[PDB]
Amino acid sequence: SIAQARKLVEQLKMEANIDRIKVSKAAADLMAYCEAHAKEDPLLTPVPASENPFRE
Amino acid sequence: ELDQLRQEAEQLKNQIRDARKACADATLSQITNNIDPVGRIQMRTRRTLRGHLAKIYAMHWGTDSRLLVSASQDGKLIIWDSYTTNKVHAIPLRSSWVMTCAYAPSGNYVACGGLDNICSIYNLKTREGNVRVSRELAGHTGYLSCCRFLDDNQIVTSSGDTTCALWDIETGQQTTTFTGHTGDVMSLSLAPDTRLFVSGACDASAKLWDVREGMCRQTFTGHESDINAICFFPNGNAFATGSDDATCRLFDLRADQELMTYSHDNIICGITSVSFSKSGRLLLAGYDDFNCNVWDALKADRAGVLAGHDNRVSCLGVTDDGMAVATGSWDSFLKIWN
Amino acid sequence: AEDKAAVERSKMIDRNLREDGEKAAREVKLLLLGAGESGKSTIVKQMKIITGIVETHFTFKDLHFKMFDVGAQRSERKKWIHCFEGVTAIIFCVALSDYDLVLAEDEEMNRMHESMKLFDSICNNKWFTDTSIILFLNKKDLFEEKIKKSPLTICYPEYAGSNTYEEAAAYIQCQFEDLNKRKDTKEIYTHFTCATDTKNVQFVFDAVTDVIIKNNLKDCGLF
Amino acid sequence: DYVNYDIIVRHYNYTGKLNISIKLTSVVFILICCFIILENIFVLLTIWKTKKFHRPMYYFIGNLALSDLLAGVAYTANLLLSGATTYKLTPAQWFLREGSMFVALSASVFSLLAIAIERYITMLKMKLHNGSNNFRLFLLISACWVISLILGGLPIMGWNCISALSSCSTVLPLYHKHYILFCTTVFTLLLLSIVILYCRIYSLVRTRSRRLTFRKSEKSLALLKTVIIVLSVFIACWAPLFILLLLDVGCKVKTCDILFRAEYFLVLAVLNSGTNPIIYTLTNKEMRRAFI
Ligand SMILES: CCCCCCCCCCCCC/C=C/[C@@H](O)[C@@H](N)COP(=O)(O)O
Ligand SMILES: *[C@@H]1O[C@H](CO)[C@@H](O)[C@H](O)[C@H]1NC(C)=O
């Protein structure tokens, strides 16, 4: 009713005033992170059969 | 006036919509258009864990990347050793209706829960004794959908009563309560830092919560149905949500806006599980059509399929070292993939 | 040195798992459902003579039953209903004396219609297509006494028949059974319950025996 | 001996069948056998293409389908290699030709018996879930095929009319009348077994159902209809040839004329082999859907 509406509007006002970033910067950040750790992902780069514990 | 205080909310919704569109400088598909594609990701079944006599509803890896725990509707919580495939432990749960499973970071305790509305914590390193029940957390009003440890003394739980809770295993009392969701919370995921966590609910939205303060930092919308699964991106600045609308979506925290949508016309069933690879370049999502699709996180194109189960893939996990993927299903088997 | 012991322990665990599984496969599984003020408590109380989800075990005529009551789940039902796919049967309870009572809506919602809607949702659910429903119509004495004062027209305005107990009771049973679209795969066993019957456990037993015979004939391909 | 072209002529001459390429009725029978073959291929294709059908009961049904397929193949071969080809055959080849038919038909009958046994055990136990007791599933099918091979290949390894020419069968001149008597007795025992088993299945279902008290038979009448259909379509299609063989053991050579027209009774028995899939797939109500 009234208290619920007050809580909802307070939460929305708290969510409004937030320092946002352009999506271009976020996309660049995700791309950079994935590119920096590409050499540490066995699923991405199948490891040599001798170093894989599930084949051995 | 209630009428006046309802009208106002739409004003803040509009303001958020506009403040967000102001940040829409370019789609993720553009900044990531010229990166080389991953190529087909062919993975095969290395192991097949047998011993459950009913549907498997959850699984979780240990931090050691070798031991995993699985929960089945036959009232069993089994701790395996994926290398040798031999059952290290089998715990006879009191309530057969389990739909959650967790493994503590320290490897000492395992938690579970479900329709009993209780989170049971079992101790594994008890002196010269069998695995006994250590604690029972009972303050939730709905079934337990997900639970994850923070350490040996704190655990976060999500419930179908539209609420999450941070507990204190020592005293068994709810330390903090997270409210704001309008539907059943179906999944939650802790951040690497253990300071924030996101939750997905049946109200078709996700929420970011601060563990120490207990407030809802941000809310994310866009899905058109229930959000069944939610996972964090490795660097802690984004997450992914899988829904019953046969779609996944990638959200960014410091953008407050959806970035990418992983969907396909041939896929019309729901998503039950989502996870990332150690690098975050692959997004593995389990579906009700008995398969698990491997999406390229930076692009949209699908890059693989894990077809090995006769019933729907219900749970999906990836090791901390990123060496293997585990996939449970309603057909009562688990599979490891490399 | 320690691998042999590990494989021994794993074999022992597998042995125990097989025993437990083959013991649990010899138990009937029943899912108890109903509206708010139905005779759920009465049914479970008279069947036991033989904060989540309540499980009731009992044995009758050399046959073990596990009945699960999940009425304390105020959450959305579509997210956990599938957990009960595979039960031997569904025991659905309906209060006849609700034919003249309104729900908390208090404007146009007739409680019997709410119960009927729930039954229609559960019976035709995609998960329960081959699972049979044992219907318990409770409060039969209260209904018998009420149907003398207020006519049944308050529910089912398209009703024309005697205002006596047998006629209206059969009418309501037929109404609840006409909602069954899967009329080729499942059945609906009906039985009018009272506060004091002494023979509801027998009815559940016979219905489960019939379900078992039918499942066996389906196993052989003889049906 | 076993390499003499004159043994076959001498026996056929003795029984009055000496006659000195595909005749009017051969083609229709051959096409009927092809129809049977493709029918039973379908049942195996559907049984093996569906994960729900991986229980032991569809293994017995598939075993029967395989037996019926083998029967169709054997009858095609026997119809092609008979007629004017009988005199271009050696007694070993003749024995193989006939033993093929005996083995295939015996296998089909034993498969029917195995299905009946499995059904009887499942109803009597009346357990909540039926597990795959693999030991019976491999111990019945093996028994069927082993007994079939031992019974059909018995005349070639002796027990034939070659030495003693008086003990010849008119229908198979190189067989022993006592061997035909043995096979007819085995068939009679199997028929009685199948009838008794299905009657006891029906009695169990009816007796158990009658003890139940409901407010508002139909399931126990459909069982009667299915049992009647199965046993009638079996006895009707196998009784002419059984009676022919009994008559053939009964009378002395050249007395009974009807014995010369024995290729109608045989086609009726193979017709049973072809009808089995229709009966064991129409009354299932679940294989119908899996077909399409
Ligand atoms: C469970 C035991 C079941 C026993 C099975 C009984 C089998 C009965 C089969 C009897 C007939 C076998 C095939 C013989 C066919 C002959 O009529 C022709 N080949 C003779 O043709 P010609 O060369 O004279 O032109
Ligand atoms: C058939 O047998 C009869 C009686 O032994 C004999 O007289 C006749 O010549 C025989 N014919 C042939 C072709 O052997």
Author numbering:
A (entry chain G): 8 to 63
B (entry chain B): 3 to 340
C (entry chain A): 7 to 56, 182 to 354
D (entry chain R): 18 to 37, 44 to 239, 248 to 323
What do the study's own words say?
Lysophospholipids are bioactive lipids and can signal through G-protein-coupled receptors (GPCRs). Here we report single-particle cryo-EM structures of human S1P receptor 1 (S1P1) and heterotrimeric Gi complexes formed with bound S1P or the multiple sclerosis (MS) treatment drug Siponimod, as well as human LPA receptor 1 (LPA1) and Gi complexes in the presence of LPA. Our structural and functional data provide insights into how LPA and S1P adopt different conformations to interact with their cognate GPCRs, the selectivity of the homologous lipid GPCRs for S1P versus LPA, and the different activation mechanisms of these GPCRs by LPA and S1P.
In S1P1, the ligand-binding site is a cylindrical concavity, 30° tilted relative to the membrane, pointing deep into the helical bundle core until the TM4-TM5 cleft, where the length of the pocket almost spans the entire outer leaflet of the lipid bilayer. The phosphate head group is coordinated by Y29 and K34 from the cap, R120 (in TM3), T109 and the backbone nitrogen of G106 (in ECL1). A previously functionally identified key residue, E121 (in TM3), does not form any direct contacts with S1P in our structure; instead, their interaction is mediated by N101 (in TM2) in the coordination of the amino group of S1P. In S1P1, the ECL0 is a flexible loop flipped to pack against ECL2 in the active conformation, which leads to an opening of the ligand access vestibule. From the inactive to the active conformation of S1P1, one essential change is the flipping of the side chain of F210 from the TM3-TM5 interface to the TM5-TM6 interface. In S1P1, the flip of F210 causes the rotameric change of L214, accompanied by the translational movement of W269 and F265 in TM6 to form new contacts. In its ICL2, L151 is inserted into the hydrophobic pocket at the end of the N-terminal helix of Gαi, and N153 forms hydrogen bonds with D350 and N347 from the α5 helix of Gαi. In ICL3, L235 and F237 contact the hydrophobic surface of Gαi, and K250 forms a salt bridge with D341 from the α5 helix of Gαi.
